[PDB]
Design a protein around this ligand. Structure first.
Ligand code: Y87
Length: 162
């Protein structure tokens, strides 16, 4: 298991524009297109992202390329963020995947997790897991949040093999 396999499980793969759990136009492996209610606005974002006139549909290769870019953008954003980088650098590789997963889903949205981040940096895993669940994130996407939290709690891939 690695971050790509983990997020592919959590996000799925759809080749036509769909709506995410918040109702926002998305495509591929969880690539947000726009928060605007305009499907035309979403289609414009898609064409700009892919570099051709897509009509709201992409190939698997294109979805995977966008996904690689999106994962990289999450990582580089963590590394540029003075709050997130020290915590990220304190984690082992499996827990770093859980961190990238959260940033991918909510963006640098993670700003409200100051207390969780402190517990993670202190390696107080059970306490961090309890704190992470006291969130809109957990209440709105509980199965995905439970998998990510279990990854932080245990440092294993058990939630994704199960
Ligand atoms: F760098 C980090 C980003 C997000 C989390 Br959650 C933990 C560390």
């Amino acid at each position: 298991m690695n971050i790509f396999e983990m997020l592919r499980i959590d996000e799925g793969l759809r080749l036509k524009i769909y709506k995410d759990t918040e109702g926002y136009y998305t495509i591929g492996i969880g690539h947000l297109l726009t928060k605007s209610p305009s499907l035309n606005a979403a289609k414009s974002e898609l064409d700009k992202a892919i570099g051709r006139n897509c009509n709201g549909v992409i190939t698997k290769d294109e979805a995977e390329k966008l996904f690689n870019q999106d994962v990289d953008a999450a990582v580089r954003g963590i590394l540029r963020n003075a709050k997130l980088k020290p915590v990220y650098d304190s984690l082992d590789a499996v827990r770093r995947c859980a961190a990238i997963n959260m940033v991918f889903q909510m963006g640098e949205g993670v700003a409200g997790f100051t207390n969780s981040l402190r517990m993670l940096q202190q390696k107080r895993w059970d306490e961090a897991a309890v704190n992470l669940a006291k969130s809109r994130w957990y209440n709105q996407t509980p199965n995905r949040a439970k998998r990510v939290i279990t990854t932080f709690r245990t440092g294993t891939w058990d939630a994704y093999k199960n």
